[PDB]
């Protein structure tokens, strides 16, 4: 049935739907929660670092592709690493080729159709990770979200993985607060800290579990973990 | 038998690709979006679905340009169209590279569909989930087409894709009969905004933003540009009054 | 196994159902059309069906001008239609480029004929569900009618029609030709040939046609071409004069 | 056993079976005080239920028997062992370490299988490998 | 062109093909190898399914990869030949490249990936052949005996057999060989071999085929009589009681 | 403590009784929270018992 | 059947999960990163007497500063190993210095997905994921010692201690119990060594298990049967006190 319609990313549902996408879409929420937001000044990432054991380390969900550009993930890390690396090239590439920073905008453009190729092309599969991407640029701080559907969006703020809604609702609730928190990463951050607390469910964010990043005007993409998250904890 | 549905390139006993038909499922599943061949030019209009506060308005812009004279809009997978958009954005410069001229819309057209038609030609080559309203002023006047994942487009004095088309289909067909004369892009601008809201009323349930663009041999001067600002607000207010 | 229908492989009968189903896609457009070699000319007429206002109806043709000399009518979906003409488009200049003189009509047919047989034999390749009839007035063969199938099968015609109602006009012309006993419509003005045709299209289709009803084209010496609605109208007028 | 939701009433004799199911459902619905009296249905399949069954106010909670685990086996073992004469220097923890999670009944194939190992090893108290071999043996010989 | 992955973790996390490869190996007529203290001896059964063969031009089971390196296997006689080649190729390469022929391991480890390739290689199946590898490294007298399998896995053996009823003869040898006391003499090793062969070969001389490598490319395959000597020799030791 | 919309958004697309599944859990979880009063947490724990 | 890259409804890869199956099959392999070093121990799991436990190696050096172990189908690693060995040298070859085991680790993890049949987005050629997951020990200047579980998932972590293979789970709890920051290598040795012998089917000897450490000084260092048998007996003494 679906095993008819789901099995192949090349194959629509009778409703014209790609369950693999929807499946990849599932691994999304399967992924750990992480949060992001932007002011016009700064764009902030807030991540939940999940570990395997305490013996293990804590999986990091945040990536730096660039000074003006770094991202966070939920779902399958391996995909993003490529993509990030792939992306890292681009800002590089641009600033290589053009000495031009990749537009966080133009960035989101890329992976989309890039992802789109994962979709329309039989024998393959979509990526298993949706992305939260903060970037600052000539157009300012930009938080963008990607979907393994290929679909990208700039948001003032957002979160993903598991139950991001709590933050999200609160963030969507919080909306004008942080976007107007300007030159104050901290409350931009602590908004997320509160945000992520909203979608915090199982436990509280910790030194190990909380991961944070910010890019901003004069804030390059900058990741905060541990003691860096400690004060915001 | 069955499974004819499953593989793209397959001719079902009826001689049909149900995937394409299933693609059309995703196609109509697209957000309602319209386009208008007006007098000098064409005009492109699409509802922008606002799903949340966190959405930064006006940023995510569905209509994409090819060259500067070719505006394009599609209902279906946004990645699909963009994928094909660049795919188009290629051919023009490509064409324009060889032919030194920016490509004629019709020239530019058939390119796409063939490419799209490829996406029919193999059971794996999943056609695109998009039908696409596109066109613009070219060497002779405007042109406006809307292309099916089938690889079917045609000349369309107006065109609409997405869910709310039928709300628009009349509305366009109206202005067809309201204005078999023709229409100023700006009135097409005005008319569309209504039509979209009307088209939106199929989708009316949720908040939305409205992307409208256009290619006016008059105003864009044979180029495609976006309906923007006041004339945009005008058409809105125009529409948002006429919606009442 | 039962995939034999899903794909091109010899059925237990050595049959190809996709082919047989491609045949379905042929009249799936439901356009009836004809090809008649006039005395001088070859003339092709077809149903121009304009279901919508929002259409630019002008844009609608399955009769395609292949070369200087050669045009073709398509019976089948416009994507597949738009394809083969393109495919055809190449060979001509190609042939001409290679061979210094334009491609003879059937050559294209035989050429294009080769094509599906490939896809016929090439499983992942699907054959195309269009029926194609190439016509020209050949420097060698003068008026010419070559129809090809989704199967790569093709032949020369004293004339032909094609469409859902093909048989009817087929009979009609077969009637008229067994009547007229000569391969071609004997008329010097293709106009008459057209007028003859539009008659016998109106005749066998039992169908009066407006000028927006008809896809009309004429293969003439060195030039294949078509008509505006007005020559069509001229015919509609002209044909209204014989009757 | 009584059947769940089924079209099998089309046979015409299964109606009684359903009628009994009907009876029960009809009966059980209203007049069972379910604050005190507990209504519980053991089954292999949770899905088979006559739709009347899982209805709220009839079956509210719906539970799976939690498969006896590394620990559960141990104690389920330990009890299985107590009928046997079994070594207590060894642990049913130790055995259940080796064993994957299996039904609280089969955990005797662990234990009661070594009443022979008790007398095979002639350890009146059957040793670790006695039951390890049982876990070996029964699962080895299992192959199903 | 043909990438189609024929080897897949099944739900259990397994490749049946891999698992079936062994079946052909099991199906493969038995082959044994054993190391004397100075030597390695390779017993192998001839598939006796037919005869009227010219046995000369009938291919022997054990095969020399290198003057000091020979191999025996179990499975498709086809799969071997390729493996045989590349190995033979390999050493010659190693020879030419390293100014030295292979160690037996290296060669073994070499051929290991080969099977291991087709394992994780799509479009192919792995070999139907597990092998036994006998040779004494250049400037090494030491007996070296390496079992391998289409899974791409291999090891060292005090002795080893493979093929149909390998366990039988193996179970035989597993006791019948002593780690601390290799049947140091070739014969006793060969005899212990022949013993282990009659376990499975079921009383045959032609059908038994022996191979023995001694140090420094010293290698011998015995005539059935030489075999039958031990065959007959063993028989008495039996019939004595 | 109850806030439906939070529940109602955190729960998703329940045919009613799954809310009641949440809810009866909540009541259950209310005593499992020791309360005779049945709260958002009871209901979020009505959410917490896996709502898929 | 079904594509291997086919996502589960969960958004998971069956094969991966099935790759995860063969993982547990492996000899239970255990390692502990001390600040003294990273202790490693594994199950030889000798399946036949004539098999000489010597030719069994589930523990391998990538480099002095980097060496690791395998539990799973030991075939897949070979490449990965040499592949791993490659980059280290390669890095060093380029960087005149040792690679971050992590970087190497991370690098080698990237091998994971490189199975595929004409996949969408890049050519990754293998029939299937890797039938083995790997304990990665290393010392790097930056991070001191480093311990990692390489996984066919391509995901990995830095384990204060880690057990993989058959009985690793309780061993992991054991490690979880046994592990503390202040562990001495020799503790962790006997710890694992016991925990092995503990979790080991076969009674631990030097031949049915294998030991190694990696040490900021000596780097990756495998333990002989002898010192193995020594620490083994040492357990038996220490294991039996109270």
- Asked if C97 and C90 touch (Cβ cutoff 8 Å), the reply is no
Q: What whole-number distance in Å separates Cα of residue B239 and Cα of residue G38? A: 72
Residues in chain G: 242
Query: How many CB atoms within 10 Å of residue D63?
Result: 9
**CB-CB under 8 Å, D56 with F20:** yes
Tokens at F52, concatenated: 């898929």
Query: Nearest CA to CA, how far is A169 from chain G (Å)?
Result: 24
D105 CB burial (10 A radius; 0-12, 13-18, 19+):
exposed
Q: Which residues pair with E53 in a beta bridge?
A: none
Of residues C234, C238, C227, the one with CA closest to residue C44: C227
Contacts of D61 in chain F (CB under 8 A): 24, 28
The Cα of B82 is separated from the nearest Cα of chain C by a number of Å equal to 21
CATH topology of domain E1-240: 3.60.20
Chain position carrying tokens 């008329």: C187
Task: Please say whether the beta carbons of G4 and E8 come within 8 A.
Answer: yes
Residues of E in contact with G19 (CB under 8 A): 9, 13
Q: How far is CA G215 from the centre of its chain?
A: 16
- What does A29-41 look like in DSSP terms, one character per residue? HHSPPEEEEE-SS
Q: How far apart are CA E52 and CA D94, in angstroms?
A: 61
E70 close to E62: Cβ distance less than 8 angstroms: yes
Q: Domain holding B67: CATH number?
A: 3.60.20.10
Q: How far is CA A118 from the centre of its chain?
A: 19
Instruction: Report the run of H or E that residue G72 belongs to, with start and end.
Output: strand G66-72
Mutate to test the interface with A, among B1, B74, B79, B115 (most CBs of A within 10 A): B79
Token pair in block for residue C224: 């294949």
Q: How far apart are CA G61 and CA B126, in angstroms?
A: 47
User: Residue G226 belongs to what domain range?
Assistant: 1-242
Q: How far is CA A208 from CA A54, A162, A186, A228, in A?
A: 10, 18, 19, 10
Q: Which residues of A touch B119 (CB under 8 A)?
A: 120
Q: Give B24: exposed, middle or buried? Use CB within 10 Å, 0-12, 13-18, 19+.
A: buried
Nearest to A27 among G3, G11, G119 (CB): G11
Strand partners, G33: G38
Spatial neighbors of C113 by CB under 8 A, at least 6 apart, are C148, C152, C153, C154
* Spacing of C-alpha G141 from chain mean position: 21
Do residues G153 and G112 lie in contact, with contact meaning Cβ atoms separated by under 8 Å?
yes
Compare all CA atoms of chain B with the CA of A18 and give the residue at the minimum distance: B26
Alpha carbon of F49: minimum distance to chain D alpha carbons (Å) = 11
**Taking CB atoms and an 8 Å cut-off, how many pairs form between chains E and G?**
104
Planar angle of CA B155, B158, B162, nearest 5 degrees: 105
User: Quick check: E141 and G35 in contact, CB under 8 A?
Assistant: no
User: Containing H/E element for G90?
Assistant: helix G74-95
Pick from C33, C43, C76, C62: nearest CA to C144:
C43
Quick check: E154 and G52 CB within 8 A? no
Which residue in the block uniquely carries the two structure tokens 């094969």?
Answer: G15
Q: Please, which chains are in contact with E (at least 3 CB pairs closer than 8 A)?
A: G
In angstroms, the Cα distances linking G44 to B19, C69, D94, G197, G204 are: 54, 82, 21, 11, 9
Chains G and D, touching by 3 or more CB pairs within 8 angstroms: yes
- A residues 172-191 near B, CB within 8 Å? 172, 175
Query: Residue G167 and residue D97: Cβ atoms within 8 Å?
Result: yes
Report d(CA E35, CA E38) in Å as an integer: 8
B230 burial level (CB within 10 Å; 0-12, 13-18, 19+): exposed
Q: To 10 degrees, what angle do helices B105-121 and C78-99 make?
A: 110
Q: Which helix (H) or strand (E) holds E106?
A: helix E104-120
Please tell me the distance from the alpha carbon of residue G228 to that of residue G211, in angstroms, as a whole number.
7
Residues 6+ apart with CB under 8 A from C124: B9, B122, B123
Q: Is B238:B193 a contact under the CB 8 Å cutoff?
A: yes
Q: Domain of B31?
A: 2-244
Number of domains within chain G? 1
Q: Which residues have a C–N gap over 2.5 Å right after them in chain B?
A: none
Residue A187's domain comprises 3-233
Q: Does A30 touch chain F (CB under 8 A)?
A: no
Q: Which of B80, G6, E9 is nearest to A124 (CA)?
A: G6
Q: For C199, list phi and psi in degrees, rounded to 5.
A: -45, -70
SS3 E155: strand
The DSSP letter of residue E15 is -
Q: Which residues pair with A37 in a beta bridge?
A: A44, A157
Instruction: Identify all chain E residues contacting G48, using CB atoms and an 8 Å cutoff.
Output: 170, 174
Token reading at C24:
């379905």
Residue G75 token pair:
């075939």
Task: Give the nearest partner residue to C82 out of B11, B114, B173, using CB atoms.
Answer: B114
State how far the alpha carbon of F18 is from the alpha carbons of A201, D56, D70, F3, F25, in Å: 20, 10, 32, 16, 10
Structural domain count of chain B: 1
Distance CA C107, CA D144 (A): 67
Torsion of CA A88, A94, A99, A101, to 10 degrees: -70
Task: Evaluate whether G138 touches A109 at the Cβ level (below 8 Å).
Answer: no
**F9–chain A Cβ distance below 8 A for any pair:** yes
CATH of the domain at G117: 3.60.20.10
In CATH, what number is assigned to the domain containing residue A54? 3.60.20.10
Do E120 and G14 make contact, defined as CB atoms within 8 angstroms? no
Q: What are phi and psi of C119, to 5 degrees?
A: -60, -35
- Strand order across the beta sheet in which C63-64 lies: C63-64, C71-75, C131-138, C142-148, C154-156
Domain ranges of chain E: 1-240
Residue of D nearest to F26 (CA): D61
Residues forming a β-bridge with G153: none
| A77-97 and A104-120 helices, crossing angle to 10° | 130
Q: Are strands A58-59 and E130-135 parallel, antiparallel or unpaired?
A: unpaired
Query: CB-based contact (8 Å) between E142 and chain G?
Result: no
What is the Cα–Cα distance from C189 to C233, expressed in whole angstroms?
A: 16
- Unique residue bearing structure tokens 């991202």: A71
The answer to whether G18 contacts E12, with C-beta atoms less than 8 Å apart, is yes
Cβ of G130: how many Cβ atoms within 10 Å?
A: 31
Burial C149-168 (b: 16+ CB within 10 A, else e): bbbbebeebbbbbbbebbeb
Q: Which two tokens stand for residue F2?
A: 């109850």
Contact (CB, 8 A) for E66 and E138 = no
| Residue F9 to residue A165, Cβ atoms within 8 A | yes
* Secondary structure in 3-state letters for chain B: CCCCCCCCCCCCCCCCCHHHHHHHHHHHCCCCEEEEECCCCEEEEEEEECCCCCECCCCCCCCEEECCCEEEEEECCHHHHHHHHHHHHHHHHHHHHHHCCCCCHHHHHHHHHHHHHHHHHCCCCCCCCCEEEEEEECCCCEEEEEECCCCCCCEECEEEECCCHHHHHHHHHHHHHHCCCCCCHHHHHHHHHHHHHHHHHHCCCCCEEEEEEEEECCCCCCEEEECCHHHHHHHHHHHHHHCC
Q: Is E224 helix (H, G, I), strand (E, B) or coil?
A: helix
Distance CA C47, CA C36 (A): 15
**G172: helix, strand or coil:** helix
Give the CA angle between residues C92, C189, C105 to the nearest 5°.
15
Q: How many residues does chain E have?
A: 241
CA distance, residue F3 to nearest chain D CA (Å): 23
Catalytic residue among B2, B31, B120, B132: B31
Q: Please tell me if residue E154 touches chain G, with a CB cutoff of 8 Å.
A: yes
Count of D-F CB contacts under 8 Å: 6
Tokens 């973990």 label which residue?
A225
* DSSP structure class, residue E160: E
Concatenate the DSSP letters of all residues of E27-76 into one string.
Answer: HSPPEEEEE-SS-EEEEEEPP-S--S--SSSSPPSSEEEETTEEEEEES-
Tokens of G52: 């000489």
A163 touches chain F (CB under 8 A): yes
Reply yes or no on whether B32 is catalytic: no
Helix axis angle, C229-242 to C190-204, nearest 10°: 70
Number of domains in chain A: 1
Long-range contacts of the stretch D65-71 (C-beta < 8 A, 24+): D67/D101, D67/D102, D67/D103, D68/D101, D68/D102, D68/D103, D68/D104, D68/D107, D69/D96, D69/D101, D70/D96, D70/D97, D70/D99, D70/D101, D70/G170, D71/D96
Distance CA A210, CA A233 (A): 8
Integer Cα distance of G14 and E54 in angstroms: 52
Domains of chain C: 2-242 (3.60.20.10)
The span from the CA of B178 to the CA of B189, in Å, is 15
Q: How many residues does chain F have?
A: 52
Q: Which two tokens stand for residue C104?
A: 């003879």
Backbone angles phi, psi at E197, to 5 degrees: -70, -50
Structure token digits, residue C165: 């109602």
DSSP assignments along D30-83, one per residue: HH--TTTS------S-STT--HHHHSTTTS----PPPPP-HHHHHHHHHHHHHH
CA B54 – CA B33 distance, rounded (Å): 23
Chains G and A touch (3+ CB pairs under 8 A): yes
Contact D103, D71 (CB under 8 A): no
Whether residue B14 and residue C24 make contact (CB cut-off 8 A), yes or no, is yes
Q: What is the resolution of this structure in A?
A: 4.8
**Contact, E35 vs E146, CB < 8 A?**
no
What is the rounded CA–CA span in Å between residue G126 and residue G140? 31
Instruction: Measure the CA–CA gap between B23 and B29, rounded to whole angstroms.
Output: 9
A191 neighbors A174 (Cβ within 8 angstroms): yes
The string over F6-16, giving b where at least 16 C-beta atoms fall within 10 Å of a residue's C-beta and e elsewhere, is bbeebbeeeee
> Nearest residue on chain E to G123, judged by CA atoms?
E3
CB-CB contact of E29 with E163 (8 Å): yes
Q: Are C71 and C132 in contact (CB under 8 A)?
A: no
Chain B residue numbers with beta carbons less than 8 Å from the beta carbon of C74 are none
What's chain C look like in SS3? CCHHHHCCCCCCCCCCHHHHHHHHHHHHCCCCEEEEECCCCEEEEEECCCCCCCECHHHCCCEECCCCCCEEEEECCHHHHHHHHHHHHHHHHHHHHHHCCCCCHHHHHHHHHHHHHHHHHCCCCCCCCCEEEEEEEECCCEEEEEEECCCCCEEECCEEEECCCHHHHHHHHHHHHHHHCCCCCCCCCHHHHHHHHHHHHHHHCCCCCCCCCEEEEEEEECEEEECCHHHHHHHHHHHHHHC
Residue with tokens 């905008």: A105
Q: Distance (Å, rounded) from C-alpha E236 to C-alpha E230? A: 10
Q: Which of A4, A10, A117 lies closest to B124 in CB terms?
A: A10
Answer yes or no: are the C-beta atoms of G56 and G46 closer than 8 Å: yes
Q: What are residue G30's DSSP bridge partners?
A: G41, G163
- Per the document, the length of chain A is 233
CB atoms near residue D74 (< 10 Å): 22
Residues of chain G contacting A59 with CB distance shorter than 8 Å: 155, 157
Mark residue B224 as left, alpha or beta (left: phi above 0; alpha: psi -120 to 50; beta: remaining). Answer: beta
Q: Does E127 contact chain G (CB < 8 Å)?
A: no
User: What letter would DSSP give residue A10?
Assistant: T
Residue A189 in contact with residue A24, Cβ under 8 Å? no
Q: What is the strand order of the sheet E63-66 is part of?
A: E63-66, E69-74, E130-135, E145-149, E153-156
Q: How far apart are CA F31 and CA B196, in angstroms?
A: 53
């Amino acid at each position: 049935f679906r095993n008819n319609y789901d099995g192949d990313t090349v194959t629509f549902s009778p409703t014209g739907r790609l369950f693999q996408v929807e499946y990849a879409l599932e691994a999304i929420k399967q992924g750990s929660v992480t949060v992001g937001l932007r002011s016009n000044t700064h764009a902030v990432l807030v991540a939940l670092k999940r570990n395997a054991d305490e013996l293990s380390s804590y999986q990091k969900k945040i990536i730096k592709c660039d000074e003006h550009m770094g991202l966070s993930l939920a779902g399958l890390a391996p995909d993003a690493r490529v993509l990030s690396n792939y992306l890292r090239q681009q800002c590089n590439y641009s600033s290589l080729v053009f000495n031009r920073k990749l537009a966080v905008e133009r960035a989101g453009h890329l992976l989309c159709d890039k992802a789109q190729k994962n979709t329309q092309s039989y024998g393959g599969r979509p990526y298993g990770v949706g992305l939260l991407i903060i970037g600052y640029d000539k157009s300012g701080a930009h938080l963008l979200e990607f979907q393994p559907s290929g679909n990208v969006t700039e948001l003032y703020g957002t979160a993903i993985g598991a139950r991001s809604q709590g933050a999200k609702t609160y963030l969507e609730r919080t909306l004008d607060t942080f976007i107007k928190i300007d030159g104050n990463p901290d409350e931009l951050i602590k908004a997320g800290v509160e945000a992520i607390s909203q979608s915090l469910r199982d436990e509280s964010l910790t030194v190990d579990n909380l991961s944070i990043a910010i890019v901003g005007k004069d804030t390059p993409f900058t990741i905060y973990d541990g003691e860096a998250v400690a004060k915001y904890i | 038998g069955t499974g004819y549905d499953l593989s793209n390139s397959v001719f079902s006993p009826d001689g049909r690709n149900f995937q394409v038909e299933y693609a059309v499922k995703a196609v109509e599943n697209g957000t309602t979006s319209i386009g208008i061949k007006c007098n000098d030019g064409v005009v492109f209009a699409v509802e922008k679905l606002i799903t949340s506060k966190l959405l930064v308005p006006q940023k995510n812009v569905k209509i994409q340009v090819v060259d500067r004279h070719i505006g394009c809009v599609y209902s279906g997978l946004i990645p699909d169209g963009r994928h094909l958009v660049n795919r188009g954005r290629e051919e023009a410069a490509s064409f324009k590279k060889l032919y030194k001229t920016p490509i004629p819309i019709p020239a530019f057209a058939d390119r796409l569909g063939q490419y799209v038609q490829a996406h029919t030609l193999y059971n794996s080559v999943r056609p695109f989930g998009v039908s696409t309203i596109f066109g613009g002023v070219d060497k002779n006047g405007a042109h406006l087409y809307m292309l099916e994942p089938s690889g079917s487009y045609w000349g369309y004095k107006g065109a609409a894709t997405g869910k709310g088309r039928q709300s628009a289909k009349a509305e366009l067909e109206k202005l067809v009969d309201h204005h078999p004369e023709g229409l100023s892009a700006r009135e097409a601008v005005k008319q569309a905004a209504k039509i979209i809201y009307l088209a939106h009323e199929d989708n009316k349930e949720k908040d939305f933003e409205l992307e409208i663009s256009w290619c006016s041999l008059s105003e864009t001067n044979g180029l495609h540009k976006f309906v923007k600002g006041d004339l945009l607000q005008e058409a809105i207010d125009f529409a948002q009054k006429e919606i009442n | 196994a039962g995939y034999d229908r899903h794909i091109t492989i010899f059925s237990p009968e050595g049959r190809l159902y996709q082919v047989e189903y491609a045949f379905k896609a042929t009249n799936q457009t439901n356009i009836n059309s004809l090809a008649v070699r006039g005395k001088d000319c070859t003339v092709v007429i077809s149903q121009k069906k304009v279901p919508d206002k929002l259409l630019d109806p002008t844009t609608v043709s399955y009769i395609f001008c292949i070369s200087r000399t050669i045009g073709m009518v398509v019976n089948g979906p416009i994507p597949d239609a738009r394809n083969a003409a393109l495919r055809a488009k190449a060979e001509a200049a190609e042939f001409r480029y290679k061979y210094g003189y334009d491609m003879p009509c059937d050559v294209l047919a035989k050429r294009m004929a080769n094509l599906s047989q490939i896809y016929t034999q090439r499983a992942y390749m699907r054959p195309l569900g269009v029926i194609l009839t190439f016509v020209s007035v050949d420097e060698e063969l003068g008026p010419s009618i070559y129809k090809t199938d989704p199967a790569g099968y093709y032949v020369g015609y004293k004339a032909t029609a094609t469409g859902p109602k093909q048989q009817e006009i087929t009979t009609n012309l077969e009637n008229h030709f067994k009547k007229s006993k000569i391969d071609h419509i004997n008329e010097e003005s293709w106009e008459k040939v057209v007028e003859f045709a539009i008659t016998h299209m109106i005749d066998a289709l039992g169908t009066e046609f407006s000028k927006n009803d008809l896809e009309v084209g004429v293969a003439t010496k060195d030039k294949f071409f078509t008509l505006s609605a007005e020559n069509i109208e001229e015919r509609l007028v002209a044909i209204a004069e014989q009757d | 056993a009584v059947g769940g939701a089924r079209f099998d009433d089309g046979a015409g004799g299964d109606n009684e079976v359903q009628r009994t199911m009907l009876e029960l459902i009809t009966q059980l619905d209203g007049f069972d005080p379910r604050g005190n009296i507990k209504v519980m249905f053991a089954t292999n399949r949770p899905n088979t239920l006559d739709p009347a069954l899982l209805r709220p106010g009839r079956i509210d909670r719906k539970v799976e028997f939690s498969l006896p685990d590394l620990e559960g086996r141990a104690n389920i073992f330990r009890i299985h062992s107590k009928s046997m004469s079994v070594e207590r220097g060894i642990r049913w923890e130790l055995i259940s370490r080796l064993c994957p999670n299996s039904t609280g009944a089969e955990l005797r194939s662990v234990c009661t299988e070594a009443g022979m190992f008790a007398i095979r090893a002639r350890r009146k108290v059957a040793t670790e490998k006695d039951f390890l071999k049982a876990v070996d043996k029964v699962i080895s010989g299992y192959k199903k | 062109g043909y990438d189609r992955a024929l080897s897949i973790f099944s739900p259990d996390g397994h490749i049946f093909q891999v698992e079936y490869a062994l079946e052909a190996v099991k199906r493969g007529t038995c082959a044994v190898g054993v190391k004397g203290k100075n030597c390695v001896v390779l017993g192998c059964e001839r598939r006796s399914t037919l005869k009227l063969q010219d046995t000369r031009i009938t291919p022997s089971k054990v095969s020399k990869i290198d003057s000091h390196v020979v191999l025996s296997f179990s499975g498709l006689n086809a799969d071997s030949r390729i493996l045989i080649e590349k190995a033979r190729v390999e050493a010659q390469s190693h020879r030419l490249t390293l100014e030295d022929p292979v160690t037996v391991e290296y060669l073994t480890r070499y051929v290991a990936g080969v099977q291991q390739r087709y394992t994780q290689s799509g479009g192919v199946r792995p070999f139907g052949v597990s092998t036994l590898i006998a040779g004494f490294d250049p400037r090494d007298d030491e007996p070296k005996l390496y079992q391998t399998e289409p899974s791409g896995i291999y090891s060292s053996w005090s002795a080893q057999t493979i093929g149909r009823n390998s366990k039988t003869v193996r179970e035989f040898l597993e006791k019948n060989y002593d780690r601390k006391e290799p049947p140091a003499t070739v014969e006793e090793c060969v005899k212990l071999t022949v013993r282990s062969l009659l376990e499975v070969v079921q009383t045959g001389a032609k059908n038994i085929e022996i191979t023995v490598v001694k140090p420094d490319s010293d290698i011998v395959a015995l005539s059935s009589e030489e075999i039958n000597q031990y065959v007959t020799q063993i028989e008495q030791e039996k019939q004595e009681q | 403590d109850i806030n439906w919309q939070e529940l109602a958004r955190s729960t998703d697309e329940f045919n009613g009784a799954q809310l009641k599944a949440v809810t009866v859990e909540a009541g259950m979880i209310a005593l499992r929270n020791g309360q005779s009063s049945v709260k958002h947490e009871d209901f979020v724990e009505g959410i917490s018992e896996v709502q898929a | 059947d079904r594509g291997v890259s086919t996502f589960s409804p969960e958004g998971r890869l069956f094969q991966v999960e099935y790759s995860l199956e063969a993982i547990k099959l492996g000899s239970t392999a255990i390692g502990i990163a001390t600040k003294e070093g990273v202790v490693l121990g594994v199950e030889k799991r000798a399946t036949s007497p004539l098999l000489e436990s010597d030719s069994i190696e589930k523990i391998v050096e990538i480099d002095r500063h980097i060496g690791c172990a395998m539990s799973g189908l030991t075939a897949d690693a070979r490449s990965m190993i040499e592949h791993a060995r490659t980059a280290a040298v390669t890095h060093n070859l380029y960087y005149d210095e040792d690679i971050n085991v992590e970087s190497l680790t991370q690098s080698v993890c990237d091998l994971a997905l490189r199975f595929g049949e004409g996949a969408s987005g890049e050519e990754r050629l293998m029939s299937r994921p890797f039938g083995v997951a790997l304990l990665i020990a290393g010392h790097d200047a930056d991070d001191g010692y480093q311990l990692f579980h390489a996984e066919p998932s391509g995901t990995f972590y830095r384990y204060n201690a880690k057990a993989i293979g058959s009985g690793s789970e309780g061993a992991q709890a054991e490690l979880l119990n046994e592990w503390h920051s202040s562990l001495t290598l020799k503790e962790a040795e006997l710890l694992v060594l016991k925990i092995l012998k503990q979790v080991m089917e076969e009674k631990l000897d030097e031949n049915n298990a294998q030991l190694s450490c990696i040490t900021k000084q000596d780097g990756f260092k495998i333990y002989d049967n002898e010192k193995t048998a020594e620490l083994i007996k040492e357990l038996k003494e220490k294991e039996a006190a109270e």
